[PDB]
A paper describes a structure:
S. pneumoniae produces up to three distinct sialidase enzymes: NanA, NanB, and NanC. NanC is an unusual sialidase in that its primary reaction product is 2-deoxy-2,3-didehydro-N-acetylneuraminic acid (Neu5Ac2en, also known as DANA), a nonspecific hydrolytic sialidase inhibitor. NanC adopts the same overall topology as seen in NanA and NanB, with a CBM (residues 85–271), followed by a catalytic domain (residues 272–740).
The production of Neu5Ac2en from α2–3-linked sialosides by the catalytic domain is confirmed within a crystal structure. When longer soaks were performed, Neu5Ac2en is still observed in the active site, and cleaved Neu5Ac was observed in the CBM binding site. When the pool of substrate is exhausted and Neu5Ac2en is in excess, NanC can hydrate Neu5Ac2en to Neu5Ac. First, Asp-315 is ∼1 Å closer to the C2 of Neu5Ac2en than the equivalent residue in NanA and NanB. This advanced position would allow the C3 proton to be abstracted directly.
Numbering used by the authors: 83 to 741
Write the structure that this text describes.
Amino acid sequence: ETPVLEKNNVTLTGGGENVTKELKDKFTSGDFTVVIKYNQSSEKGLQALFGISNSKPGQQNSYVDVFLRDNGELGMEARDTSSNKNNLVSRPASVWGKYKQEAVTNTVAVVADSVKKTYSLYANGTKVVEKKVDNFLNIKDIKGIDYYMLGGVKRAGKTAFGFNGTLENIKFFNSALDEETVKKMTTNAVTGHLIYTANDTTGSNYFRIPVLYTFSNGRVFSSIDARYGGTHDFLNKINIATSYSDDNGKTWTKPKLTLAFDDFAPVPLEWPREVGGRDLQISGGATYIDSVIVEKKNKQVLMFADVMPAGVSFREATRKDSGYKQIDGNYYLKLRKQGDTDYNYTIRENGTVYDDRTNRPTEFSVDKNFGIKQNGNYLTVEQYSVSFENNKKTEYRNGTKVHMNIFYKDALFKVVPTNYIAYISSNDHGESWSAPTLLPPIMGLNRNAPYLGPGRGIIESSTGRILIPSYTGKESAFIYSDDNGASWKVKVVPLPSSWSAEAQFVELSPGVIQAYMRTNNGKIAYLTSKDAGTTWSAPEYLKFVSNPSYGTQLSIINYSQLIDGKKAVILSTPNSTNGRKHGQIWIGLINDDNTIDWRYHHDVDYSNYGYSYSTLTELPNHEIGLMFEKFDSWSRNELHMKNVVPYITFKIEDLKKNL
Ligand SMILES: CC(=O)N[C@H]1[C@H]([C@H](O)[C@H](O)CO)O[C@@](O)(C(=O)O)C[C@@H]1O
């Protein structure tokens, strides 16, 4: 199939270009595909890449366009005045604006298919949306089309939605092209910045909570939440996926599921984005959520994550029970057998399940990956799938048999419905991993575990103390080990208010560490310890970030090279009171007195573009890796979007801006 019109290198500054002669009545069937490779000179205002309209007086609601907003939303309109049919199809956060001070080339497309009555939009290799509409209009359905233009829409003799930039290449076809052809046509350099993609080797359509870490051997490692039933924190099914690079982040391994349950199949699901329907959740698979990575002195790598039993959400988890008993001074994970009210059982030595009323072993045991055996044989349960087809959610037993697990809703023995922390270890830098270990009840028997602060942990240089950041909702919990991670303890620091205090650490000088964290007051807080984390200062606040009350996670890392003759820290966060937007990377130089001079910053894209959770690492060549949620992950308008967690690289000279 060849285009009815192809144009190259059309630079426009809001005035558009008439192409009526070269497109008039060429859309025989009425269907269309338009593929546009462009870059914007300015993101301001509502801008049309092209417009097909009735330009006559009174016919201002008779047009088709593809549009861009200042927040990266890609959409299309198809409207007819006399039928009063107004179709708008879009998805937030579909395009990129600028990157390292330069306009980004995107390639987008629209397909209108009369037989299916669907409009489809594509950006940078991804089908960002396909929607069937009852009031479907093709070009022939709109009355009195007489004007076709690039970079605007002709409404009552005036150019509306003027485009500012260059249409590097634009192709108009008079048919609906197939999905695979259009994905291929829109694939470009931007496509290559995704490490995790929808329905890759994770099986997940969605992702959140990226983490980057550079190991001692030069390997750059990533982990992420693979979130299967939309991007909901809860209820959902979530696994932790991983992917790594041995060439300074240029190429990455196909992602693997590293922490995953199998009560639910890890399947690609088309989660609804409509008002109302977008609130839909599955009934909940067992879940791993919010990963934290650290490399030990001995090069062993640890990964932590929160563990959620099936159907248990952070909102519903009981705060008054750890899920453990103490018996003869040992902490044993406790179990309730189906049909009991009390928790009468414990997992003791060798995974043997004991009846605590009699202090005798039962027929039952639990292996290192939480699977239940009876007399040495695995009990099983049937896996669940989720499906739509293509309007109504169904959960059903799918014919696959998996091991019965103490975290599953169909288990004969179940854990307390609360949150836990698990960790795993690797001796080959993330190629293979141990079985999980649940953290003992460090908060006490009658409190739930803390919640991890996603990102990294650190090794404090003077003592060797390992620090893992977490929070409870009213306190900071700094989890630590003084024996190279053989045993874990905690410092609980009460906070001014009920902050979701996701934190990250930096070391200023030997023994002096600061914990930077999310608050509920709009500011980033930092607490200071001068005894390697044993005691902490009252909070102080950065003076240059102002965010909404809900706040967002941040990333801060130490940097190994001097900047302006000084030891440096590097911080990533959104900075906007309007939402999770206006991503910034800040360089802080450490003063002789261990205060920080926040001297430089660089804006990641335009200020109304989305920016939520993020993660920084120093690459082995001293460049900076960044992976981030390129959307607003709090907004109810930006839920359940595919392919929006990119990875980018900066030289320090790219970052040394604004002073
Ligand atoms: C993509 C989009 O939102 N288009 C809408 C526009 C713009 O909001 C404003 O023109 C601001 O540029 O406003 C309309 O009232 C209009 O012009 O008929 C409805 C239309 O659907």
